[PDB]
Amino acid sequence: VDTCSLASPASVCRTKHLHLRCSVDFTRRTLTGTAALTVQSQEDNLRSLVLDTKDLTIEKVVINGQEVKYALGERQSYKGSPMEISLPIALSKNQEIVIEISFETSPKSSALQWLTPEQTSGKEHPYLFSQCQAIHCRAILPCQDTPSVKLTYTAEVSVPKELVALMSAIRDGETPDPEDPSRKIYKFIQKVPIPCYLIALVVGALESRQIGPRTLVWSEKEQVEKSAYEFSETESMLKIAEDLGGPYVWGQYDLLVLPPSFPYGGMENPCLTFVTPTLLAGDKSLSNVIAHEISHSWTGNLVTNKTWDHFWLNEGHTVYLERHICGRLFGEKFRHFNALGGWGELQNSVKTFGETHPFTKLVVDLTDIDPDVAYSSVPYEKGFALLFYLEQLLGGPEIFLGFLKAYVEKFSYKSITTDDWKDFLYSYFKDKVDVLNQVDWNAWLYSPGLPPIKPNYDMTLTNACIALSQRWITAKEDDLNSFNATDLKDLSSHQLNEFLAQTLQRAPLPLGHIKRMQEVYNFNAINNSEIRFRWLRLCIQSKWEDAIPLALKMATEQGRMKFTRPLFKDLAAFDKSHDQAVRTYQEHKASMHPVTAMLVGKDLKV
Numbered sequence: 211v212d213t214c215s216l217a218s219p220a221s222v223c224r225t226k227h228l229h230l231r232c233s234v235d236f237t238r239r240t241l242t243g244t245a246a247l248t249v250q251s252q253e254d255n256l257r258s259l260v261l262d263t264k265d266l267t268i269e270k271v272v273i274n275g276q277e278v279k280y281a282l283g284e285r286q287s288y289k290g291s292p293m294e295i296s297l298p299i300a301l302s303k304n305q306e307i308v309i310e311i312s313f314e315t316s317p318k319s320s321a322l323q324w325l326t327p328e329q330t331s332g333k334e335h336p337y338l339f340s341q342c343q344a345i346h347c348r349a350i351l352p353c354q355d356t357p358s359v360k361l362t363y364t365a366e367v368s369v370p371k372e373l374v375a376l377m378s379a380i381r382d383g384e385t386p387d388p389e390d391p392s393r394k395i396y397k398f399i400q401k402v403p404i405p406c407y408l409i410a411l412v413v414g415a416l417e418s419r420q421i422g423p424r425t426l427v428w429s430e431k432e433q434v435e436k437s438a439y440e441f442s443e444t445e446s447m448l449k450i451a452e453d454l455g456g457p458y459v460w461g462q463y464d465l466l467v468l469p470p471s472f473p474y475g476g477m478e479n480p481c482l483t484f485v486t487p488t489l490l491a492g493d494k495s496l497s498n499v500i501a502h503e504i505s506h507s508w509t510g511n512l513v514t515n516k517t518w519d520h521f522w523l524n525e526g527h528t529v530y531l532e533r534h535i536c537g538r539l540f541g542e543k544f545r546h547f548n549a550l551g552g553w554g555e556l557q558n559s560v561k562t563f564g565e566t567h568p569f570t571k572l573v574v575d576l577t578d579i580d581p582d583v584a585y586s587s588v589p590y591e592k593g594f595a596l597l598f599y600l601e602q603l604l605g606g607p608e609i610f611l612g613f614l615k616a617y618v619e620k621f622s623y624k625s626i627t628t629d630d631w632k633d634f635l636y637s638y639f640k641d642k643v644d645v646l647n648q649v650d651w652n653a654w655l656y657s658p659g660l661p662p663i664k665p666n667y668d669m670t671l672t673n674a675c676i677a678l679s680q681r682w683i684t685a686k687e688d689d690l691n692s693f694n695a696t697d698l699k700d701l702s703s704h705q706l707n708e709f710l711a712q713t714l715q716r717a718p719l720p721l722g723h724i725k726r727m728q729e730v731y732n733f734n735a736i737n738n739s740e741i742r743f744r745w746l747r748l749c750i751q752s753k754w755e756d757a758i759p760l761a762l763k764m765a766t767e768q769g770r771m772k773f774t775r776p777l778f779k780d781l782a783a784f785d786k787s788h789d790q791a792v793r794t795y796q797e798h799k800a801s802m803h804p805v806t807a808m809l810v811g812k813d814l815k816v
């Protein structure tokens with residue numbers, strides 16, 4: 211059972227379909243309308259059921275054309291309030307009914323960010339975007355807010371006529387609103403059953419450009435051309451992903467490039483992946499994030515974690531496929547380089563949390579834990595590390611990719627646990643059970659800290675990064691002169707990034723060294739967000755006051771939590787910038803993403 215949801219479990223009843231009919235009110239910052247849930251009983255004599263909600267105003271509940279009794283329970287912190295609905299007629303097993311709920315969201319909905327015109331590129335129109343993963347769908351509409359339940363959906367969304375609505379679904383047409391000629395209704399259909407965390411909505415001044423046979427890029431006009439170029443590898447990655455995972459079942463693969471406050475690198479919303487504009491490096495260098503979102507079209511969206519305790523299933527397999535796509539595009543040596551970088555990121559997380567911390571377990575227990583607080587690189591990189599280790603144990607990438615395809619096939623349209631996965635691994639590799647029995651399952655799955663075994667990694671592309679990092683770390687003042695721009699001559703942006711990641715692991719460095727680095731390498735000039743991020747962290751941790759306004763600027767001018775949280779934490783930990791860090795958060799907090807605002811607040815202890 212799902213300890214993050216207050217709703218009736220799938221063993222009691224199952225939502226089959228949602229029909230959403232709503233209107234987006236920018237003046238009140240509310241979504242208002244009806245959620246018609248088609249619900250199937252899994253039980254004899256079913257007379258009531260419970261749905262998740264969060265900061266919702268319920269107007270009424272209609273079944274068979276009549277209003278019915280319902281009750282909202284006490285709020286249970288981040289989980290919201292359970293909504294019990296009294297059914298007018300007892301249902302037998304497998305009977306289906308339609309429950310129509312009239313509702314309105316709160317302006318403070320944790321699923322939503324409402325932006326004013328000034329927070330947009332165009333400066334003329336406001337903008338709304340949603341982010342339901344993990345348990346924020348309940349903050350938009352009453353539902354069984356659990357990925358153990360999969361449903362199809364259709365929607366009609368009324369918005370001001372000069373704006374465009376898009377959803378995680380196939381666009382099903384647009385018309386003027388019959389009830390308000392200042393408005394348009396956009397329609398949508400998602401024919402593939404999905405967990406509700408994949409329900410997504412954006413409303414804004416969006417334009418589009420085609421970039422492949424099944425891909426449009428959407429953004430405000432100011433970002434269209436840059437995005438089109440940045441993400442032009444999309445079709446090639448789709449074709450590789452299809453070869454590894456099987457048929458792409460979703461119809462279109464569109465991309466939406468959000469305003470800078472989008473809290474993640476990407477969100478695998480079906481038909482319409484959302485991405486941060488921090489990917490717009492100008493050279494396609496951050497395209498692994500596209501490869502990752504693409505991969506989710508199989509691992510996560512087809513095969514889904516049953517509860518959030520098993521999130522590593524989603525993320526581990528996705529990073530595994532992601533790195534295969536990039537290895538196919540750029541070479542096996544590059545896949546190894548990225549894999550080893552991933553291990554470094556895992557070292558960082560474990561170090562940050564502490565090696566005995568419960569969140570460093572692969573499988574976690576989220577009872578009384580807000581998933582947003584628990585979120586880290588761990589399920590991503592410990593999950594990937596397990597798969598990469600198993601790959602090497604079981605005969606290599608070709609063999610293990612056979613397993614991954616059979617795994618996707620086996621569990622498509624289903625929600626599964628770690629035991630489901632492990633059971634199938636044993637079934638698939640039944641001629642290799644002796645080898646599988648060598649794995650320390652208890653440690654890998656259930657123990658905190660770094661994995662019991664580290665995989666083997668080709669070092670070719672990593673060597674120069676480590677070598678240069680070591681030069682700087684071991685350098686004394688009289689060695690600083692020997693550093694020069696030519697040190698970077700043969701390094702890719704990826705290698706520059708890894709050089710910085712290596713050095714950041716030993717931070718602080720002497721202030722004079724960092725000053726010299728800027729002198730000879732001019733890292734302040736680099737706009738690649740991954741590079742600039744690590745460089746600013748290195749500067750602040752090394753107590754360079756000059757970097758304070760740069761770090762403050764990056765932390766606030768975009769809101770990708772990966773960057774904003776550690777930049778804020780670094781700034782707070784530096785005595786010279788502490789007060790300004792706190793003041794800056796205080797001033798920006800009301801106009802930040804609500805989840806980001808909450809977490810930075812916790813991070814800063816304000």
Ligand SMILES: NCc1ccc(-c2cccs2)cc1
Pocket residue numbers: 343344345518519520521522574581582584585586589
């Ligand atoms: N992106 C929302 C989010 C999704 C998953 C999780 C976790 C599941 C298990 C450990 S963290 C946390 C936050």
Ligand SMILES: [Yb+3]
Pocket residue numbers: 686688689
């Ligand atoms: Yb010396």
Ligand SMILES: [Zn+2]
Pocket residue numbers: 502506524525528
């Ligand atoms: Zn992911």
